[PDB]
Design a protein around this ligand. Structure first.
Ligand code: 5ID
Ligand code: NA
Length: 341
């Protein structure tokens, strides 16, 4: 049995790769995962980055066991010496910190590589499919995270969480305390169990912390989920492809959320320029502000168009102000004159 091993920078069990190296899918294989892992550990540890001949990493023969073993042996020797350095006065790498954005992208790729065996069985009806998460949705999610600035008072739910990528990313990147994903379909929920196991393993391998999270199987339209959605502070829902009946039902669930509750989605649930009046009083735009977030630069979905998400914030002052105006005869005449102009 031939194999390649990479030591963990924090003394977790080593990553073991059999030879011949696995192919994970059409653009990802274990040889390049090994090279990228070494690169990302170098970003975590300056002394390792100094010791490695950094531009040579690309010049190894990924088809030669002897070449690849040479690279891994060089990394492993460097890790041993860094662990010795840390037994001295030098301070060890800080533990229990969150991964940088670049490291997190890599970790999520590596989780996906090890977890998802038949990518064809996935229902690629969203703007981007899970196969390209790192180049596309990952950056949309990262931008969203920086915009919404969640705190430890928040509770995050991904409705229709697929193989779990959004939940893993957000749980690794935010001070939010609790993170849930719920997914109805058997195949992605099955893959999500492996993703969960591998993410926890790799995060410990790199010495990085994530917040608490749970990936479940379920129907987000069930009665149990009504109460749960009502008590969620941030919802993510990739509703781009959902039919009118599903979006209608979701709207009814969001109408129970608390003030300041937020929903990020791939298709808006209300017009961006809602103007409340007598005929539209029961519509969801009466209780939320809706804005389009900055799009992802440099990619297009299979529609051929740029992609962006939509942020909805529960805000009942829209409705409060409308009723206060109705009360005042002057303002009521002016509202009727503006609707008719
Ligand atoms: N009612 C539901 N309860 C839980 N998950 C749901 C649904 C429905 I409709 C769709 N999905 C999942 O949503 C994902 C697409 O965003 C896809 O992964 C799709 O399977
Ligand atoms: Na170097």
């Amino acid at each position: 049995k031939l194999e390649l091993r990479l030591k963990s920078p924090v003394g977790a069990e080593p990553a073991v790769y059999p030879w011949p190296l696995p192919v994970y899918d059409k653009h990802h294989d274990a040889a390049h995962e090994i090279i990228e892992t070494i690169r990302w550990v170098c970003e975590e540890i300056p002394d390792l980055k100094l010791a490695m001949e950094n531009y040579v990493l690309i010049d190894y023969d990924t088809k030669s066991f002897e070449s690849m073993q040479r690279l891994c042996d060089k990394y492993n020797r460097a890790i041993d010496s860094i662990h010795q350095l840390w037994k001295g006065t030098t301070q060890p790498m800080k533990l229990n910190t969150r991964p940088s954005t670049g490291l997190l992208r890599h970790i999520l790729q590596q989780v996906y590589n090890h977890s998802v065996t038949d990518p064809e069985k996935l229902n690629n009806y969203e703007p981007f499919s899970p196969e390209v998460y790192g180049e596309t949705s990952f950056d949309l999610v990262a931008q969203m995270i920086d915009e919404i600035k969640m705190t430890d008072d928040d509770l995050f739910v991904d409705l229709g969480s697929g193989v779990g990528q959004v939940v893993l990313q957000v749980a690794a990147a935010t001070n939010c305390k609790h993170h849930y994903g719920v997914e109805k379909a058997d195949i992605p929920a099955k893959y999500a169990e492996t993703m969960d196991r591998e993410f926890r393993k790799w995060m410990k391998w790199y010495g990085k912390k994530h917040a608490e999270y749970t990936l479940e199987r379920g129907d987000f339209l069930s009665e149990e989920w009504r109460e749960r959605i009502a008590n969620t502070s941030v919802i993510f829902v990739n509703n781009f492809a959902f039919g009118p009946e599903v979006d209608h039902q979701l709207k009814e669930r969001f109408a129970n959320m608390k003030e300041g509750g937020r929903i990020v989605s791939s298709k808006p649930f209300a017009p961006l320029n809602f103007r409340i009046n007598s005929r539209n009083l029961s519509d969801i735009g009466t209780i939320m502000r809706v804005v389009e977030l900055s799009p992802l630069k440099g990619s297009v979905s299979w529609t051929g168009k740029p992609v962006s998400y939509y942020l909805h914030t529960i805000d009942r002052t829209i409705l409060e102000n409308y009723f206060s105006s109705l009360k005042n005869p002057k303002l009521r005449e002016e509202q009727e004159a503006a609707r008719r102009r």
